[PDB]
Design a protein around this ligand. Structure first.
Ligand SMILES: *[C@@H]1O[C@H](CO)[C@@H](O[C@@H]2O[C@H](CO)[C@@H](O)[C@H](O)[C@H]2NC(C)=O)[C@H](O)[C@H]1NC(C)=O
Ligand SMILES: *[C@@H]1O[C@H](CO)[C@@H](O[C@@H]2O[C@H](CO)[C@@H](O)[C@H](O)[C@H]2NC(C)=O)[C@H](O)[C@H]1NC(C)=O
Ligand SMILES: *[C@@H]1O[C@H](CO)[C@@H](O[C@@H]2O[C@H](CO)[C@@H](O)[C@H](O)[C@H]2NC(C)=O)[C@H](O)[C@H]1NC(C)=O
Ligand SMILES: *[C@@H]1O[C@H](CO)[C@@H](O[C@@H]2O[C@H](CO)[C@@H](O)[C@H](O)[C@H]2NC(C)=O)[C@H](O)[C@H]1NC(C)=O
Ligand SMILES: *[C@@H]1O[C@H](CO)[C@@H](O[C@@H]2O[C@H](CO)[C@@H](O)[C@H](O)[C@H]2NC(C)=O)[C@H](O)[C@H]1NC(C)=O
Ligand SMILES: *[C@@H]1O[C@H](CO)[C@@H](O[C@@H]2O[C@H](CO)[C@@H](O)[C@H](O)[C@H]2NC(C)=O)[C@H](O)[C@H]1NC(C)=O
Ligand SMILES: CC(=O)N[C@@H]1[C@@H](O)[C@H](O)[C@@H](CO)O[C@H]1O
Ligand SMILES: CC(=O)N[C@@H]1[C@@H](O)[C@H](O)[C@@H](CO)O[C@H]1O
Ligand SMILES: CC(=O)N[C@@H]1[C@@H](O)[C@H](O)[C@@H](CO)O[C@H]1O
Ligand SMILES: CC(=O)N[C@@H]1[C@@H](O)[C@H](O)[C@@H](CO)O[C@H]1O
Ligand SMILES: *[C@@H]1O[C@H](CO)[C@@H](O)[C@H](O)[C@H]1NC(C)=O
Ligand SMILES: *[C@@H]1O[C@H](CO)[C@@H](O)[C@H](O)[C@H]1NC(C)=O
Ligand SMILES: *[C@@H]1O[C@H](CO)[C@@H](O)[C@H](O)[C@H]1NC(C)=O
Ligand SMILES: *[C@@H]1O[C@H](CO)[C@@H](O)[C@H](O)[C@H]1NC(C)=O
Ligand SMILES: *[C@@H]1O[C@H](CO)[C@@H](O)[C@H](O)[C@H]1NC(C)=O
Ligand SMILES: *[C@@H]1O[C@H](CO)[C@@H](O)[C@H](O)[C@H]1NC(C)=O
Ligand SMILES: *[C@@H]1O[C@H](CO)[C@@H](O)[C@H](O)[C@H]1NC(C)=O
Lengths: 344, 171, 195, 98, 47
């Protein structure tokens, strides 16, 4: 193990003089990726099932704390509807589902790796499929039946452990196929209409002339595009190939951290059911048997207070995380309107 | 042996050492037990399971409701069976009729399915993303506008909320 | 005047509901024998009423704490909204914005502010093209073994004749040497036409 | 359920979460070991000679039903206090290392 | 050089005040007989 002083970067010097200028003579077409989180998992909690279980004595003792559970569930539902609103602001910008024609004559540019693949069950692109397999979720579907984990399969499958304690995960409103349809419409509009479909009705224009407009927008004359069209198309195709390559090779850490954080929060909730909180045991059935009502109520009160504050901590941290995801989704919506529907 | 509880007992594959009688999971609840007369191990599984949601068009319009059992797959652990049973990737929906059309979402059920109080009864459908469109793209065709419209739109933004103060002692 | 400002009414509703929830949470025992201090202080003597009063104090303190925490979170969200509104005031009202969909749908022309209870309303005036028409087009024009490109327009053709127009409004004009500029010969551009 | 969790008699259009699906127990079962004898209540409480407190006696008890109601006719205790358990629960339990 | 950076000093002030408030909150009984563990552990037996 070695320890060193970190370097800030390579040293450089500019040959500045009062009558010297440097002018470029060639260019490169670069393609870069930017990843942004847009939603997190929507969860719900049953207080009675988490705090008491099937205990009727505990559930009758809990009726002095019903306002707190209505409050918790109000907060969680606010988060849950905010997630769907986030996805809608990002992806549902345009409400016309444009298709790209079978005329794949785009001046030499090849958009085959980002356009839908009709050979799949879904209509996801090649790049979208490569992205889909680099993020491992925790819920492959949202129907886990009672008979499916009945026995010791519970408390060995974390999801049934969460479900037996009242912790539910709700499915998003837009399926993945609908989101793929939205991105497909955005791509088709942007490659057959330029930036006009974001300001009104889509007005077609040949792709090379649209690229010449975009070259004008950065301070380069159009003849620079028209005289170098094959070189530019080849550079673009090579850069797109480089992306797929890199991906299929080896990540989406910022999107996996969201899944990891939500799963860890739920599992921490489940393990915090082993705390005594100052009682004689952490099981309601060891207290309710070996102790009679009036003097078991003190222990059950300790347990109730502890578990309520556990739920409260969870909900608070979920609210804070949802605020951060909301900021990220707002940034993604701004980038969608200003980089995809226009030129910045 | 004095330990009380509620649940479902099933035959087990766990195998206890001779000095063991109960088995506990990570939440420290008893999930296995050795029967004191037959000396066989049993698993104890809880009895309640599965979320439930209720879809109403508002009780100021009707007291018809639909119920979504978010963990059932019918092709049951339901309160009633009625008619119009419709399976969804969000659960089994009971009380709403499935149609083949598609509209804008009214009440979001989930997984692409919405519900609405149409024709009265409750219907469930797949939400539509929008009208389909196609651009007449060719390699030498352009579309140029010949007129314009001046549009005025509103945008609302919250700027403040209520300023409050609390006296601890008085509360 | 017909028929809403839901985003501005939700703020009022949320604050009122939070205060009223605080008030109703004064009916909780929190594990004591009653939720009234006067039923405890009468029928119980100091040292053994102190346990009940301690339970009540702890419960009500945590109620206040929950309220303050959720108020802080909501205030952060309102702060973000107010920052966005200030940016929109400086960039859409005090200027003209080139950012797409920042000051309405269309090409932004101007904006006017109006005040509302706890908020602001922007009236965005934008320009939306309409009544489009199809034309044949070309990237360049070849005249004397030279390629001519438009200066600030696009080459269109009504079917037989060629004109140069502006991109956002059909206003055809005759192609001259003041509309175009020359660069190179007629062998490199792909869809060049003779005119 | 929703009317009552809302604390209102009117419900507005929408979808609301209710409690998880509950199932009620149908039967009650008890499973104790096969024990037939009664515990030596008459050679612990009715012994003829007790020990000195400095050399107190300790006796092991196992494999017997602890039906203490048989002590109601022949015994009257001036002090009886249990720690860690309730006296009203002693008839339902089962005891280890007595 | 004359005369400020209030927005940068408020951050330092807030963090310092939070830590010091943590330290002074060690003088609360929270409903116990004292706020010192050594006064409880001496004069009282474990249970
Ligand atoms: C532009 O001209 C300058 C002037 O010679 C070149 O820069 C110097 O390069 C040498 C060798 O790399 C360095 O040791 C000097 O420090 C540089 N700076 C000076 C002398 O001020 C530079 O290479 C030229 N740039 C191009 C693109 O040709
Ligand atoms: C501008 O740069 C490109 C490279 O990006 C040059 O084209 C390359 O030329 C070399 C040598 O002729 C070939 O081996 C490569 O295959 C070319 N690249 C591509 C993508 O075709 C081009 O010559 C440069 N232009 C000038 C004027 O220097
Ligand atoms: C551009 O559109 C406007 C409508 O926005 C047209 O003006 C309308 O013309 C019709 C028929 O002449 C009248 O009934 C309306 O009263 C006019 N509207 C207004 C607001 O005055 C206009 O003719 C169109 N121009 C072209 C060249 O088509
Ligand atoms: C394209 O536009 C030109 C206008 O320059 C049309 O040609 C003129 O049409 C007018 C009226 O029909 C005649 O008086 C002129 O003699 C024509 N020629 C010129 C040089 O002005 C032409 O008809 C249009 N073509 C189509 C298909 O609409
Ligand atoms: C407890 O008593 C039961 C009977 O009350 C015993 O059950 C017997 O078990 C044998 C197995 O070797 C069977 O052949 C008998 O038919 C059972 N009897 C009944 C009535 O079911 C049991 O064996 C006893 N416990 C022990 C440890 O021996
Ligand atoms: C302890 O000794 C007493 C007295 O010898 C026993 O009590 C008798 O119990 C029977 C049955 O309940 C009664 O009919 C008699 O009246 C009792 N004796 C007297 C003097 O009243 C008792 O059974 C002995 N305990 C044990 C465990 O054997
Ligand atoms: C290279 C790739 O990924 N896909 C195809 C390839 O399979 C096919 O041979 C080629 C010509 O049809 O076009 C491309
Ligand atoms: C009864 C039923 O729904 N069966 C389907 C089966 O046809 C389908 O192939 C499978 C796909 O995973 O899902 C299940
Ligand atoms: C031909 C083409 O490319 N696009 C459309 C075509 O799909 C449509 O049927 C027709 C009638 O509106 O208008 C044009
Ligand atoms: C008048 C004129 O320029 N005619 C030329 C012709 O000679 C040549 O064969 C053809 C192909 O390049 O292009 C044209
Ligand atoms: C586009 O590139 C792919 C390689 O991924 C190739 O299969 C396809 O033939 C290319 N399209 C054209 C028109 O050359
Ligand atoms: C619902 O009932 C109230 C009172 O009966 C009434 O004021 C209200 O207008 C009703 N809702 C509608 C949409 O009419
Ligand atoms: C219901 O069961 C069928 C086959 O048993 C399965 O294909 C389907 O996925 C299940 N329901 C859902 C929506 O998962
Ligand atoms: C609805 O869609 C189904 C899909 O198979 C089709 O069979 C049916 O004819 C359509 N009309 C109905 C059943 O209302
Ligand atoms: C443009 O021409 C195409 C090809 O027939 C047609 O689909 C479309 O209606 C035309 N657009 C206009 C605005 O005339
Ligand atoms: C446009 O495509 C046609 C095919 O219909 C082809 O003949 C022509 O050369 C192409 N022109 C350009 C500029 O791409
Ligand atoms: C354009 O003009 C040149 C010279 O007159 C001629 O060689 C060329 O073939 C022409 N192009 C077409 C498409 O007629």
């Amino acid at each position: 193990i070695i320890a060193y002083t970190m370097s800030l970067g390579a040293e450089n010097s500019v040959a500045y003089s009062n009558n010297s200028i440097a002018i470029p003579t060639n260019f490169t077409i670069s393609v870069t990726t930017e990843i942004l989180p847009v939603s997190m998992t929507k969860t719900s909690v049953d207080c009675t099932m988490y705090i008491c279980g099937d205990s009727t004595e505990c559930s009758n003792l809990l009726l002095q704390y019903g306002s707190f559970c209505t409050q918790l569930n109000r907060a969680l539902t606010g988060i849950a509807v905010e997630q769907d609103k986030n996805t809608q602001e990002v992806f549902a910008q345009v409400k016309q589902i444009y298709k790209t024609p079978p005329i794949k004559d785009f001046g030499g540019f090849n958009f085959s790796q980002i356009l839908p693949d009709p050979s799949k069950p879904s209509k996801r692109s090649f790049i979208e499929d490569l992205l889909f397999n680099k993020v491992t979720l925790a819920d492959a579907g949202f129907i886990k039946q009672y008979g499916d984990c009945l026995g010791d399969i519970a408390a060995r499958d974390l999801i049934c452990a969460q479900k037996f304690n009242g912790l539910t995960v709700l499915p998003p409103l837009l399926t993945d196929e609908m989101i793929a349809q939205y991105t497909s419409a955005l791509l088709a509009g942007t490659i057959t209409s330029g930036w006009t479909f974001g300001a009104g009705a889509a007005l077609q224009i040949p792709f090379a002339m649209q690229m010449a407009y975009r070259f004008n927008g950065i301070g380069v004359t159009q003849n620079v595009l028209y005289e170098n069209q094959k070189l530019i198309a080849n550079q673009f195709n090579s850069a797109i190939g480089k992306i797929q390559d890199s991906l299929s090779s080896t990540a989406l850490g910022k999107l996996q951290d969201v899944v990891n954080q939500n799963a860890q929060a739920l599992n921490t909730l489940v393990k915090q059911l082993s705390s005594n909180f100052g009682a004689i045991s952490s099981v309601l059935n060891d207290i309710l048997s070996r102790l009679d009502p009036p003097e078991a109520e003190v222990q059950i009160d300790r347990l109730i207070t502890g578990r309520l504050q556990s739920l409260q901590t969870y909900v608070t941290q979920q609210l804070i995380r949802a605020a951060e995801i909301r900021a990220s989704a707002n940034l993604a919506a701004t980038k969608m309107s200003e980089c995809v529907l226009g030129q910045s | 042996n004095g330990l009380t509880g509620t649940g479902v007992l099933t035959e087990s594959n766990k195998k206890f050492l001779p000095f063991q009688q109960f088995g506990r999971d990570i939440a420290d609840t008893t999930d296995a037990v050795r029967d004191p007369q037959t000396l066989e191990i049993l698993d104890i599984t809880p009895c309640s399971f599965g979320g439930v949601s209720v879809i109403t068009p508002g009780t100021n319009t009707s007291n018809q409701v639909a119920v979504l059992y978010q963990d059932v797959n019918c092709t049951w652990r339901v309160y009633s069976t009625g008619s119009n049973v419709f399976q969804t990737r969000a659960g089994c929906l009971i009380g709403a009729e499935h149609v083949n059309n598609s509209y804008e979402c009214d009440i979001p059920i989930g997984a692409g399915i919405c519900a609405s109080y149409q024709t009265q009864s409750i219907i469930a459908y797949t939400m539509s993303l929008g009208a389909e469109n196609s651009v007449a793209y060719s390699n030498n065709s352009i579309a140029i506008p010949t007129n314009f419209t001046i549009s005025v739109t509103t945008e609302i933004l919250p700027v403040s909320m209520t300023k409050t103060s609390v006296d601890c002692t008085m509360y | 005047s017909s028929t809403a400002l839901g985003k501005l009414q939700d703020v009022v509703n949320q604050n009122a509901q939070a205060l009223n929830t605080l008030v109703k949470q004064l009916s909780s025992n929190f594990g004591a024998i009653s939720s009234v201090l006067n039923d405890i202080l009468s029928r119980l003597d100091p040292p053994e009423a102190e346990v009940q009063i301690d339970r009540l104090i702890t419960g009500r303190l945590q109620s206040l704490q929950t309220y303050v925490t959720q108020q802080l979170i909501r205030a952060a969200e309102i702060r973000a909204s107010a920052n966005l509104a200030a940016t929109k005031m400086s960039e859409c009202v005090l200027g003209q914005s080139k950012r797409v969909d920042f000051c309405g749908k269309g090409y932004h022309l101007m904006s006017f502010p109006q005040s509302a209870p706890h908020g602001v309303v922007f009236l965005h005036v934008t320009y939306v093209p309409a009544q489009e028409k199809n034309f044949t087009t070309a990237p360049a024009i070849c005249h004397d073994g030279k390629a001519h490109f438009p200066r600030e327009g696009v080459f269109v053709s009504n079917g037989t004749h060629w004109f140069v127009t502006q991109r956002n409004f059909y206003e055809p004009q005759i192609i001259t040497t003041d509309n175009t500029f020359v660069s190179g010969n007629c062998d490199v551009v792909i869809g060049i036409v003779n005119n | 359920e929703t009317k009552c969790t809302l604390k209102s008699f009117t419900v507005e259009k929408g979808i609301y979460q209710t409690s998880n699906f509950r199932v009620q127990p149908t039967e009650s079962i008890v499973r104790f070991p096969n024990i037939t004898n009664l515990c030596p209540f008459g050679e612990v409480f009715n012994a003829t000679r007790f020990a000195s407190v400095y050399a107190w006696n300790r006796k092991r008890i196992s494999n017997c039903v602890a039906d203490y109601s048989v002590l109601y006719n022949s015994a009257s205790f001036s002090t009886f206090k249990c720690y860690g358990v309730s006296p009203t629960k002693l008839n339902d339990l089962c005891f280890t290392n007595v």
